[PDB]
């Protein structure tokens, strides 16, 4: 589709020129555009050319490509990757749920609760224990803890030479 | 260990063979490649101007394609969530 199609749709292939079916050679031209030849049987084709996604936002490109796959029953997979360094992930909050750890978070959580009801006197005066009780160990699922709440920001900033 | 596999130069060491053909073979894998806005527009109601200039350099712009000749997907419900941070 980066070729000047209106001038090259003739003069591409010779035997198509002989038979006179040059207007029906597969190509781009001539929100999304519905292709037609994807309705009849596809036996002598093996490759899908995908065009129109460069320059757009990531999530909309994913949504549009997946819906287009669903509408015509095509077979391929889709992933996305980034160019850069790791510490650029500062414009987003990171969280997650792993099944492998669920049975642990319960096991721990209730345990702490029990310990609360046996050292309550001294513990309800230590500020650190109250903050740790009301920030963690009081949430239903571990998925609600973001990645930034697990470490000290100042030491991490001290880890890069630029901060000095 | 999951977030570190979102980067091109580190994904490439576990799955070598990425090439650009402008599409995907039947049954293959289509890889999009994106970058932050800060790296494209290097140097081009004042408060609305400032917030627009800031948010339009945090966007993810799709820049390139590659293809792979295999699909890797098969019922676990573990996942990772990424939430855009407010300005």
């Amino acid at each position: 589709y980066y070729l000047n199609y209106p001038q090259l749709y003739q003069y591409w292939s010779y035997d198509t020129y002989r038979k006179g079916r040059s207007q029906s050679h597969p190509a781009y031209f001539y929100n999304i555009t519905p292709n037609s030849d994807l309705l009849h049987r596809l036996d002598d084709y093996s490759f899908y050319r995908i065009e129109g996604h460069i320059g757009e936002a990531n999530a909309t490109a994913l949504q549009r490509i997946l819906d287009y796959q669903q509408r015509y029953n095509l077979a391929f997979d889709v992933i996305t990757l980034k160019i850069g360094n790791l510490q650029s992930f500062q414009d987003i909050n990171i969280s997650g749920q792993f099944d492998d750890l669920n049975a642990d978070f319960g096991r721990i959580k209730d345990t702490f609760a029990k310990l609360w009801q046996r050292y309550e006197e001294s513990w309800s005066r230590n500020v650190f224990l109250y903050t740790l009780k009301r920030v963690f160990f009081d949430k239903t699922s571990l998925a609600e803890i973001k990645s930034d709440q697990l470490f000290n920001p100042i030491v991490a900033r001290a880890s890069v030479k630029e901060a000095y | 260990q999951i977030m570190e596999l979102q980067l091109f130069h580190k994904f490439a060491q576990n799955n070598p063979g990425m090439e650009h053909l402008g599409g995907v073979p039947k049954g293959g894998t289509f890889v999009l490649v994106y970058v932050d806005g800060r790296e494209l527009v290097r140097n081009l109601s004042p408060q609305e101007l400032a917030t627009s200039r800031e948010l339009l350099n945090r966007e993810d712009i799709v820049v390139g394609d590659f293809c792979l000749p295999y699909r890797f997907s098969s019922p676990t419900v573990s996942y990772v969530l990424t939430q855009p941070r407010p300005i």
């Binding site: 669920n102 049975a103 319960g106 096991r107 209730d110 609760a113 | 419900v77």
Partner: peptide, 22 residues
């Protein structure tokens, strides 16, 4: 109330098992 550790553990485990089976 002595079974509450088992309560939370089994709630989480049975939820995960239920989702996979569903």
């Amino acid at each position: 109330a002595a079974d509450t550790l088992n309560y939370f553990e089994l709630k989480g485990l049975m939820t995960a098992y239920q989702q996979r089976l569903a």
